[PDB]
Ligand binder design. Structure first.
Ligand SMILES: CCCCCCCCOCCOCCOCCOCCO
Length: 148
């Protein structure tokens, strides 16, 4: 049995003018030595904050917790699909002191590929999609790590 731990930059974009929002992603994958089928869990977090000249301030945070099956195609490539929950927390302050916060969970799902350019190294690329209330958040991920 082996495990693969990867991490890297994540970047979210929602339909509706909610520009790019940067963060990170971590995945923990587990494989058995004698089956191509394993499991992978994924943690994603992005955020963006903005303060206008008017004094107004906005802060958006996105969390995605997903997991699913991972299939090893050959020695250097595997594919995976994940499902779970997405959480969005949106903070807004109308200067000087009017605040309004909203948060809610939604379904999240994703798919990715992991390459092993050397047996102990992993290059991970995935996309994650969540629907929180009516906003659709899409997040691209590129990570790296070790298999051990
Ligand atoms: C979106 C990407 C694809 C989603 C990955 C789904 C991968 C699920 O597995 C598909 C293949 O089925 C697995 C085989 O388990 C049997 C192996 O042999 C067992 C030991 O004797």
């Amino acid at each position: 049995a082996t495990s693969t731990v990867t991490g890297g930059y994540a970047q979210s974009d929602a339909q509706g003018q909610m520009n790019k929002m940067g963060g990170f992603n971590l995945k923990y994958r587990y494989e058995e030595d004698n089956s191509p089928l394993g499991v992978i869990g994924s943690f994603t977090y992005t955020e963006k904050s903005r303060t206008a000249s008017s004094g107004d301030y906005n802060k958006n945070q996105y969390y995605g917790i997903t997991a699913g099956p991972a299939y090893r195609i050959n020695d250097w490539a595997s594919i995976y699909g994940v499902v779970g929950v997405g959480y969005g927390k949106f903070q807004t302050t109308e200067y000087p002191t009017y605040k309004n916060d909203t948060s809610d969970y939604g379904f999240s799902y994703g798919a990715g590929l992991q390459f092993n350019p050397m047996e102990n190294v992993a290059l991970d690329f995935s996309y994650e999609q969540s629907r929180i209330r009516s906003v659709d958040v899409g997040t691209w991920i590129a990570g790296v790590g070790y298999r051990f």
